[PDB]
Symmetry: D3
Subunit: 244 residues, 6 copies
């Protein structure tokens, strides 16, 4: 299996056009895409220890959810120097599917929507991040599903009492920004996502939106694990995970 | 004491000139500054519940650290309508000292710098948020001070081992943005602040910067309490706190 | 009749999408739209004396042509404090139909076009402010219609002699800006609108465009009166005008 | 007297440094500044008729307060073609002192400040358009001076009653913009300027600021006439005025 | 033949919409388009010596490929004063067809594409500057065609050896910018255009794109001559060229 | 000599403060500045072939005048991948002094100013690129110096005849932009620089400014060679040049 053919496979599952404007998806680091791949590594972040571990584990193709850079740079020093040095010395390909993997069908957001068995699930935003639908059950049933499958100790901002058969909004990753709370508050009773901060918490309380922070990491890894299983089932390649 | 005279007192302590560019400091809500003040309320946030509590307790002058609005509006609906309705029905004056109170001398950042008895402390940024200096002691002595005076369970990102007599940077509030971690990594071994998120955590680990999240709330309330005592000692009026 | 149902009625007559980009139309001030309305007030401007008079006259629903704010603000002091205080203390709803009422069918611009009986009238701009068509008659017939129905002492910039059966352009409100004069000069012989200034007058003379300033107030009130009659005819509500 | 030498004289009186940012002051149209000048024409506006009149009367050097263009062009058609054609066929030099002539000492704003004998006058803005000081007398004395020296029928927006010895702000030209009324309301009881429009009128009434519109034209011609006398007294050439 | 009818003819051949965004095509200088034209002048640049020569040669209508101004101005001095003076004193019309003449059918780029007999030629950019296709022959055959019909001494940046039947990209005028080299390098083996500079040369060498600079002047004049022949064949007018 | 110490030496000669706004000076590629340097390579451009040649010759520290990137990137493919791969595999340090080396004293512009023995030389721009002064001699003496020390076949745009003792402006690199010709025409009779293009040539002819294009390459290499000798004389390490 050549590198281009792995990319071709991923892009069929999660087309790059789906990614929201400005998102740095696609090839991050690499030159020869007809190179043969004997081992595939998958990770949430293209972090320094992830890349170090990929080098140690003999990874040929490194697939990450988050891009290497979101802001363009014009100097190569410090950390990015260290990262690139390892990738280039071993000719390791770095490729990312970011929001296109969040948004696509059977993607990270769909994965959560299926975990909570939402009824008539819809995209939360038009672009089309997140899912929203009815959760058929009690708040404590919802909360135990979360504790068992996502994160053992989610932070709960219990702004209000939640009735059975409530609308649950899910967004994998960083979805608890102030503008997001305001947006989702008009569309859901409970919001499951990650990366809660003070102003977002205060805002959720005022708007009566119940927010459950299951962390950025856990809400994405859940889906990423499913995607890993999908690659394993369809690709005749060694696949390992590096940070999950 | 008239409202203008309380404002004159606060502004002598924390001049508005000190606030960073774009910060919405000063009079938030109010018209007649010759109103007499029998009771002053102080709060971290001008939240709905704080304002509700201010009304219930007969607060005349409501002082908050965070501004009512950071982004301007031209319509009055939902929460902001409710807040304004209460303030205006009782003619409660809302005044804020935000970053000018972070930056001034014996301000929120100085309060932290003084708790850890930083040696030769300097402003962390040019503008001049935060403090940085040498902590005379071990990392565990630093952490035990933190647990006792600030927050019992701070999140510690222990990127590396810390020698005694290390450079400590402190910043009250939201100081754990990605750009901030990058900046502070060049100036300190340990960074104490609030509102950690995933991308910032990964970055601190890569940079070898130790980050301690004692929460946005706690790192600012510590200083706000001292300022509350300062107001009580010098003004001859009842002073109550609403969200701390 | 509930507040939402009054809004629903106005928006059927003058859809909000019709309004030009950036125009602050719609709900200005209010929270509960299922509130019952016993008295409706209509005014050109949401001025302080208009709001004071609405409070004195027991107005429940205040409808204005001009929005309360065009530029967003983040502090509530002085005049806007005074205005909001009255509106919020009496729970008076403030709603505006601005350019959507200028542009719609049988709107303020159509009203003028029908007063002058323009033949084959067309929108003056593409967006689609103003009307333009042939006036069937002399300039002095046009001028006497204006003096009788719009304003007794219009300012006339008689740039040129005007033939019978000339093209008349009308724009209710502020239509005598420099760019507007330049635009209309290529499309009409005479331009009837409001708010003339020196540079616009000089420009009209050079371009040979005859401009008649019947004032911003009068050119809009004419149409606003018609709209008031329409609400009276169709709504079973007390309707009063506050500044006309 | 050569053109450069007239320019040198004017610029000694009203330095170009004084003009506010973006103001198109200086040489408007001209190539050879060693041309001899037998007749100098002065005007408020570089209008088509002024330039036509300049040609007819054999003006060599045309001095205007307003610039030929405020917004840049890259095509030459219509009016601007006609203007340039006349100027170039006769090699008439067009030079402007705009806001620098408003701001300088004994300039258009000083002229007004000196007519009302303002006490301890200061610049109204920081840049430093307009003047403000105490008028030693009654409002009717102020108005009678205005009617006799400036304009016989000024528009008066009598927002409130005015005590004797009030603070008067003067600004020659267009000073009655919405933002200006808001600014001046904080600094004066009465504001004298030109080019009133509807939204500015309403705002002055709300702010309790008395506004007197003596027209853009008249409030600037008053000063221009003094400057005309200054040029006659000091230059040994024929000086005529074209639009005043 | 009236001026408008010459313009109408050119615009049928090269529609103005075809021009890329921001391009200053169309009427440059002129007022009366029903003026009769007895002599037509065509030139690459509306330069001072071109305009001087047009005046001396009794040109009524001056057609240029490059516009008089690309950046708008608001002062008329120096060169532009000299140019306009001649054009306006003789009432010479200045009209330009710029990128609309580069892009249209049988335009300057098509002219080159036909000189090199490219097979299956396509627009180089989407907007739709330049042409690209297979050159049926050797590099030295290509080079001799260039030397015989375009320019005797083209600068060749021989980045690589070029095979027979290579892809040739052509762009008349300034096509050798850094971004252009990068773009074309992915689409052609050899790039024929004008205005080479150091950074563009260095870049071409790295990318292995062979660049032939036949100068901005020559690559456009070739097509301009063809267009001149077309006007001569179809218009019953005296046509002369001024700078070629 | 450690890398930091070579950097310290260069920066003493050409301070980074001197570089104009936005210029990407300093460390381009590198991580450990305590690396020992046995061989220093100097180049005009950090081109692919220069870096290839640097690797082949065992260069430890690669110093270039032009930066690696002027516009920031966030993906690593093609040429930039190849460059970084070589630099990182050998841990070759890439450092640039760009406009700061143009501007400093005895810098690239001074070198030219000193070759022509300009009298009373001053910075050409305020920032302070280029030099200008009187050349003591005839134009042919100037040209013969140019042909002997800079470039044997400079392109001369002889716009007009030049008197002896003329004002000469020199600027190493790309100084022949349209705006630059316009600027320099106001300050000098002859302008020596590099990278002439068509629109600049026409403009120089119109302005009567004599332009001599001795190429971007040659006008900068002349100074770079002197700087190379300066480094050899003061550092005790092997110094080689790669593209000159
Ligand atoms: Fe994420
Ligand atoms: Fe805060
Ligand atoms: Fe209006
Ligand atoms: Fe004016
Ligand atoms: Fe061209
Ligand atoms: Fe250079």
């Amino acid at each position: 299996m050549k590198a281009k053919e792995i990319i071709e496979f991923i892009e069929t599952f999660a087309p790059k056009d789906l990614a929201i404007e400005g998102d740095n998806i696609g090839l991050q680091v690499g030159d020869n895409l007809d190179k043969e791949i004997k081992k595939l590594g998958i990770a949430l972040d293209p972090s320094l220890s992830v890349i170090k571990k990929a080098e140690k584990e003999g990874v040929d193709f490194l697939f990450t959810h988050h891009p290497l850079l979101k802001d363009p740079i014009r100097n190569f020093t410090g950390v990015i120097y260290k990262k690139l040095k390892i990738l280039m010395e071993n000719d390791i390909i770095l490729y990312s599917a970011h929001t296109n993997l969040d948004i696509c069908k059977n993607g990270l957001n769909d994965a959560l929507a299926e975990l909570y068995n939402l009824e008539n699930p819809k995209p939360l935003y038009d672009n089309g991040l997140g899912r929203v639908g009815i959760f058929k059950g009690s708040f404590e049933e919802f909360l135990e599903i979360t504790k068992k499958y996502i994160h053992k100790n989610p932070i709960v901002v219990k702004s209000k009492e939640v009735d059975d058969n409530f609308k649950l909004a899910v967004l994998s990753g960083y979805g608890l920004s102030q503008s997001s709370i305001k947006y989702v508050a008009e569309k859901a009773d409970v919001y499951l996502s990650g990366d809660l901060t003070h102003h977002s918490k205060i805002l959720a309380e005022e708007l009566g939106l119940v927010v459950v922070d299951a962390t950025h990491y856990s809400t994405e890894v859940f889906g990423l694990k499913k995607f890993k299983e999908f690659l394993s089932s369809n690709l005749d390649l060694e696949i390992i995970s590096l940070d999950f």
